Paper text:
An excellent model for such studies is the non-enveloped bacilliform virus APBV1 infecting the archaeon Aeropyrum pernix that has the highest optimal growth temperature, 90 °C, among aerobic hyperthermophiles. The double-stranded, circular DNA genome of the virus (5.3 kbp) is among the smallest known dsDNA genomes. It encodes for the major capsid protein (MCP) VP1 (8.3 kDa) in addition to three minor capsid proteins VP2 (9.7 kDa), VP3 (11.2 kDa), and VP4 (21.4 kDa). To study the molecular basis of the extreme temperature resistance of APBV1, we have determined the three-dimensional structure of the purified APBV1 virion using electron cryomicroscopy (cryo-EM) to ~3-Å resolution.
Two-dimensional image classification of the segments and Fourier–Bessel analysis of power spectra calculated from 2D class averages revealed a defined helical symmetry (rise 6.10 Å, turn 16.55 degrees, 21.75 units per turn, pitch 133.7 Å), cyclic symmetry (C5), and the polar nature of the capsid structure. In the cryo-EM map, the fold of the VP1 glycoprotein and the density for most of the large amino acid side-chains were resolved, allowing us to build a VP1 atomic model de novo and refine it. VP1 is almost entirely α-helical, consisting of two long α-helices (α1, residues 5–42; α2, residues 53–77) linked by a type 1 beta hairpin (residues 43–52), and flexible termini (N-term, residues 1–4; C-term, 78–81). Two adjacent prolines (Pro25 and Pro26) mediate a kink in α1, which facilitated initial assignment of the sequence to the density. α2 is also curved at Gly66, but to lesser extent than α1. The arrangement of the VP1 subunits in the capsid resembles the blades of an impeller, with the small size of the VP1 protein, and more specifically the curvature of the VP1 α-helices α1 and α2, allowing very compact packing of subunits. Each VP1 subunit makes extensive hydrophobic contacts to six other neighboring VP1 subunits, resulting in a large interface area of 2916 Å2 (55.5% of the total solvent accessible area of the subunit). A large number of aliphatic residues pack closely with each other, with Leu14, Leu21, Ala24, Met28, Ala31, and Val35 of α1 packing against Met61, Leu68, Val69, Leu73, and Ile76 of α2 to form a very tight hydrophobic interface. Our analysis suggests that this interface contributes to APBV1 stability at high temperature. VP1 is glycosylated, and sequence analysis using NetNGlyc13 revealed an N-linked glycosylation sequon (46-NST-50) located at the tip of the loop region. Although the density map does not direct assignment of the VP1–DNA contacts, or an unambiguous determination of the DNA conformation, it suggests that the DNA follows the positively charged helical tracks formed by the VP1 residues Lys9 and Arg79 exposed on the inner surface of the helical capsid.
Residue numbers in the entry:
A (entry chain A), B (entry chain A), C (entry chain A), D (entry chain A), E (entry chain A), F (entry chain A), ...: 10 to 79
Write the structure that this text describes.
């Protein structure tokens, strides 16, 4: 059972240095996520923000998940 | 029967050092779980909190579960 | 699991210097994306703009994606 | 049966001087396991830590394992 | 069994003077890993950084791996 | 195992004096990589630049690669 | 491995005095690459130009190539 | 049977004056087993150490081995 | 068996006065192992260094090797 | 075994007074290794330089090589 | 081994007074290497130049070559 167990543990241990990186990605990008037509520009910046947030909540699941079954 | 029995025992023995880790994950993440639009930010922090709590109650089941049948 | 894990990490790490380049491409092109018939010209410039923006939001997914399954 | 028996015994006898070494490896490495981007660095140090811990629990199995069947 | 056993041991013993070298390689290279177009340059430096980090975590596996089976 | 091990080590040791040379090649060439038609010339200079950058990231892999398997 | 290694190194070292020559060839030729029919002449001069440019980008590959495999 | 028997006996009798010598070799060498690049040197000294240790455990096998079959 | 046995012994006995010489060779050479193009020179000095180090670890094997089989 | 052994030793002993000579050859030649067409001359000088450098690294191999097998 | 060794040494020692001569030959000839048809003459002078340059690079090989094998 430890095969999955560690997979889970690792996934938990890896969540904060991944979500650390992840956020540096999304900030490094937010400048490049808005569509200017004339003068009025319209971002889709914080769409991609959410990508990260449910990715966040999601990883801490995967860990806790792979500890308890398929 | 001991094949499952130990699987259960292990799962109980492993519950507090897993929920130890787990919590360090969710705190290491709570900074990175909120979606700021203008100035007003809106977390989904404690959603992921719950992920852990029913994961908690859940593991102590799995242990006690694999001791008594499919 | 690290095989995919890194694939993900790399993909996140690579998102801002890719979206850096990408944007230099789309600006280097916007002059060459409009169809002049008589005198009235009609761009399709910012079509290609969007190409980049959902490409943007998309990469930060791929990273976070390859960390959690097929 | 002694063919496997000793394989097991050896594996047990070898567990503490292997996990002795192993740990010196993982400490000798933890300096070289973190990805600095600007100023903010983000380790994946203790991922590799776990590698050792379930490797640990795992070896003491292999010993006890090769004593009792395929 | 010692044939693999040592292969493993060696691999552990060799991990910190390899990851010592490895890092001197990646620093000796980071100057030569960025693509300047006009004035704005865009590195892919820390992509190659990660190459090393999962290489790191990976070696300490290989050691512990070749001790326990195919 | 040392047969591959050294191949790897060498490859790491050789990465910075190769990427040293490599860059002197690509600069010695960038003058000779642009196609002038009338007056307007159009380089493909920094295409060949990238050749080097993923060659870079690539070598530091090969080293770390030949240490761990086929 | 040095057999290929040097082949590569040489190829890099040889790229700028080859692309030096090469260009003197293509200029020495551009006078003799246009098909005059009546009065209107039509060159194919800069076709042969490109021959050199992708030859350029190509050599700096071959070098970096023969360092890393078949 | 004595043909192999003695081969074994000899091999046992020869193990401590061989491992006596062997160690004098590996110490006489450890000064000449480290790769200094700038100032930071990185040994591979104790790799070769292990060479001896599993050589050790190995000889005492060969003896006991050639007493009992192919 | 002594035919190989001595071959081994000799090889061990010969390792430190060979690696003594060897190193005097590689130092006597390191001045003559760097390729200067304009002003910037680029050594491949410590490539040849490694040649010696795995040669080192390798000899102490050959000795211990020729004591135990083909 | 000494037949090859000395061949090796000699080859090591001979490496620095050969690479001494060798370099005097390549300097005595570098004046006579460049192809001037009009006014612009283009050397292939440092091609031949490399000839020596991998010849260098190569000899110190041959020595260490002929000590350990075909 | 000295039979080839000297052949090599000699070949190195002989390279600069041969390439000394060689060049006096090719200059003594360059007047007599161009085909004049009407008034426009067309040399093949520097073809023969190259003959010497790769002859150059080539000799310094032969020396270093005959030191290390068939």
């Amino acid at each position: 059972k430890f095969k999955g167990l560690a997979v889970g543990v690792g996934a938990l241990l890896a969540a904060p240095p991944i979500m650390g990186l992840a956020s540096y990605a999304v900030n490094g990008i937010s400048s490049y996520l808005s569509i200017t037509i004339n003068s009025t520009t319209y971002d889709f910046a914080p769409l991609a923000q959410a990508v990260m947030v449910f990715g966040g909540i999601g990883l801490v699941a995967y860990g806790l998940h792979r500890i308890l079954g398929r």
